[PDB]
Amino acid sequence: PVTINNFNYNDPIDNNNIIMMEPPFARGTGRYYKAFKITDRIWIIPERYTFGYKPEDFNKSSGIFNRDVCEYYDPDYLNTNDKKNIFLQTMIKLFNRIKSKPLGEKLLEMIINGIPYLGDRRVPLEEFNTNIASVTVNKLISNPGEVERKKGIFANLIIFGPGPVLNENETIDIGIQNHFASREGFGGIMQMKFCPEYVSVFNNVQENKGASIFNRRGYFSDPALILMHELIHVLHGLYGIKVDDLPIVPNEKKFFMQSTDAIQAEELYTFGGQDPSIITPSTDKSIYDKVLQNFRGIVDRLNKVLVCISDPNININIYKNKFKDKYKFVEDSEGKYSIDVESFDKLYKSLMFGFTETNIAENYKIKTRASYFSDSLPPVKIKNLLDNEIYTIEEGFNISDKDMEKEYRGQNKAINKQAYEEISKEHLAVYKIQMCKSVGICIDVDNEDLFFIADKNSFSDDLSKNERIEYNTQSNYIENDFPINELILDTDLISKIELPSENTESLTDFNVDVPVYEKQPAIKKIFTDENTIFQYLYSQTFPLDIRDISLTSSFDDALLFSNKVYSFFSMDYIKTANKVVEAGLFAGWVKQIVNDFVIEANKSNTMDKIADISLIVPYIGLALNVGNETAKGNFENAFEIAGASILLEFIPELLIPVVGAFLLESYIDNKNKIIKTIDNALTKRNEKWSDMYGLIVAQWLSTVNTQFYTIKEGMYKALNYQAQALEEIIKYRYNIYSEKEKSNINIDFNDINSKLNEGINQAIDNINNFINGCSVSYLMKKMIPLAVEKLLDFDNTLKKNLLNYIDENKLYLIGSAEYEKSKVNKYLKTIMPFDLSIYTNDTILIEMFNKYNSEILNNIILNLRYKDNNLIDLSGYGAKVEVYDGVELNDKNQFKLTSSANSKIRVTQNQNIIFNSVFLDFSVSFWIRIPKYKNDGIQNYIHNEYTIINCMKNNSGWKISIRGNRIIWTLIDINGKTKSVFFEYNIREDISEYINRWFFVTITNNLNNAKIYINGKLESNTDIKDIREVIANGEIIFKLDGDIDRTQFIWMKYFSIFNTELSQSNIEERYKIQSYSEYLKDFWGNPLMYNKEYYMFNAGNKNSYIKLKKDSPVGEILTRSKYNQNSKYINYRDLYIGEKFIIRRKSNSQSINDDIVRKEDYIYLDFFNLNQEWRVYTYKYFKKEEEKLFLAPISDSDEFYNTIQIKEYDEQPTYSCQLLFKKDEESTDEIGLIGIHRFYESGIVFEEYKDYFCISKWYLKEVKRKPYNLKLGCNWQFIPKDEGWTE
Q: Does 540 bind Ca ion (CB under 5 A)?
A: no
CA dihedral 596, 599, 600, 602 (to 10 degrees): 160
C-beta of 532: minimal distance to Ca ion in Å?
Answer: 17
**How many other CB atoms sit within 10 Å of the CB of residue 1230?**
14
Nearer Cβ to Ca ion, position 189 or 695?
A: 695
Q: What are the start-end ranges of the H helices in 815-920?
A: 819-827, 843-854
Applying CB under 5 A, which part among 276-284, 331-339, 713-721, 773-781 lies near Ca ion? 276-284
C-beta of 738: minimal distance to Ca ion in Å?
Answer: 30
d(CA 152, CA 311): 10
Q: Does 279 bind Ca ion (CB under 5 A)?
A: yes
Applying CB under 5 A, which part among 270-278, 870-878, 921-929, 971-979 lies near Ca ion? 270-278
d(CA 279, CA 293): 20
Q: Does 564 bind Ca ion (CB under 5 A)?
A: yes
Which helix (H) or strand (E) segment is 282 a member of? helix 281-304
C-beta of 563: minimal distance to Ca ion in Å?
Answer: 7
Find out whether 84 and 47 touch, Cβ atoms under 8 Å: yes
Nearer Cβ to Ca ion, position 137 or 729?
A: 729
Find out whether 1169 and 1108 touch, Cβ atoms under 8 Å: yes
Nearer Cβ to Ca ion, position 535 or 1033?
A: 535
Given 22, 109, 230, 649, the catalytic residue: 230
Q: Report which residue's Cβ sits closest to Ca ion.
A: 279
Q: Does 1086 bind Ca ion (CB under 5 A)?
A: no
Site string for Ca ion, 990-1009 (x = CB under 5 A): --------------------
Is 179 labelled a binding residue? Answer: no
623, 624, 630: which is closest to 645 by C-alpha? Answer: 630
C-beta of 551: minimal distance to Ca ion in Å?
Answer: 10
Residue 338 backbone zone (phi > 0: left; psi -120 to 50: alpha; other: beta): beta
d(CA 993, CA 1001): 14
Q: Does 284 bind Ca ion (CB under 5 A)?
A: yes
Nearer Cβ to Ca ion, position 284 or 921?
A: 284
Number of shown-chain residues binding Ca ion (CB under 5 A): 6
Our answer to whether residue 71 is catalytic in this structure is no
d(CA 1115, CA 596): 51
Nearer Cβ to Ca ion, position 656 or 874?
A: 656
C-beta of 265: minimal distance to Ca ion in Å?
Answer: 8
Applying CB under 5 A, which part among 278-286, 642-650, 678-686, 1087-1095 lies near Ca ion? 278-286
Start-to-end CA span in the chain (Å): 99
DSSP letters spanning 652-680: -----PPPPPEEEPP-TT-HHHHHHHHHH
Is 674 labelled a binding residue? Answer: no
Which helix (H) or strand (E) segment is 518 a member of? none
C-beta of 106: minimal distance to Ca ion in Å?
Answer: 24
Applying CB under 5 A, which part among 269-277, 911-919, 928-936, 1037-1045 lies near Ca ion? 269-277
Q: How far, in whole angstroms, is CA 362 from its chain's centroid?
A: 24
Tallying the residues shown for the chain, one arrives at: 1287
The dihedrals phi and psi of 269, each to the nearest 5 degrees, come to -65, -50
Rg of the chain, C-alpha, whole Å: 40
User: Restricting to residues 1024-1043, which ones interact with Ca ion according to CB under 5 A?
Assistant: none
Nearer Cβ to Ca ion, position 157 or 565?
A: 565
Coil vs helix vs strand at 825 = helix
- Kindly provide the b/e burial profile for residues 450-484, where b requires at least 16 CB atoms within 10 angstroms of the residue's own CB: bbbbbbeebbbebbeeebebbbebeeeebebebeb
Nearer Cβ to Ca ion, position 489 or 560?
A: 560
DSSP letters spanning 300-367: HHHHH--EESS-TT--HHHHHHHHHHHTT-EE-TT--EE--HHHHHHHHHIIIIIS-HHHHHHHHT--
Find out whether 191 and 158 touch, Cβ atoms under 8 Å: yes
d(CA 384, CA 127): 49
d(CA 262, CA 281): 19
Find out whether 490 and 139 touch, Cβ atoms under 8 Å: no
Q: Does 276 bind Ca ion (CB under 5 A)?
A: yes
User: Restricting to residues 541-560, which ones interact with Ca ion according to CB under 5 A?
Assistant: 558
Is 1230 labelled a binding residue? Answer: no
What residues pair up with 791 in beta bridges, in sequence order? none
Nearer Cβ to Ca ion, position 458 or 480?
A: 480
Find out whether 708 and 775 touch, Cβ atoms under 8 Å: yes
d(CA 1232, CA 1235): 9
* Cβ neighbours of residue 696 closer than 8 Å, sequence gap 6 or more: 654, 656, 779, 783, 784, 787
C-beta of 709: minimal distance to Ca ion in Å?
Answer: 19
Nearer Cβ to Ca ion, position 287 or 920?
A: 287
Nearer Cβ to Ca ion, position 284 or 640?
A: 284
Is 1236 labelled a binding residue? Answer: yes
Is 1186 labelled a binding residue? Answer: yes
Site string for Ca ion, 458-487 (x = CB under 5 A): ----------------------x-------
C-beta of 479: minimal distance to Ca ion in Å?
Answer: 9
C-beta of 713: minimal distance to Ca ion in Å?
Answer: 21
The dihedrals phi and psi of 138, each to the nearest 5 degrees, come to -95, 150
What residues pair up with 896 in beta bridges, in sequence order? 888, 1051
Beta strand 564-566 with 550-552: parallel, antiparallel or unpaired?
parallel
Nearer Cβ to Ca ion, position 248 or 1219?
A: 248
C-beta of 552: minimal distance to Ca ion in Å?
Answer: 8
> Which segments of 804-844 are extended strands (E)?
none
Cα 127–Cα 130–Cα 135 angle in degrees, nearest 5: 125
Coil vs helix vs strand at 1217 = strand
User: Restricting to residues 290-329, which ones interact with Ca ion according to CB under 5 A?
Assistant: none
Q: Does 1061 bind Ca ion (CB under 5 A)?
A: no
Find out whether 62 and 56 touch, Cβ atoms under 8 Å: no
Q: Which amino acid, one-letter code, is at 1221? A: F
C-beta of 279: minimal distance to Ca ion in Å?
Answer: 4
Nearer Cβ to Ca ion, position 564 or 799?
A: 564
Coil vs helix vs strand at 466 = coil
C-beta of 539: minimal distance to Ca ion in Å?
Answer: 6
Annotated binding site for D-galactose: 1236-1237
> Which of the residues are catalytic?
230
User: What are the residues binding Ca ion (CB under 5 A)?
Assistant: 276, 279, 284, 480, 558, 564
Q: Which residues are annotated as a binding site?
A: 229, 233, 267, 1021, 1185-1186, 1236-1237
Show binding-site residues for Zn(2+): 229, 233, 267
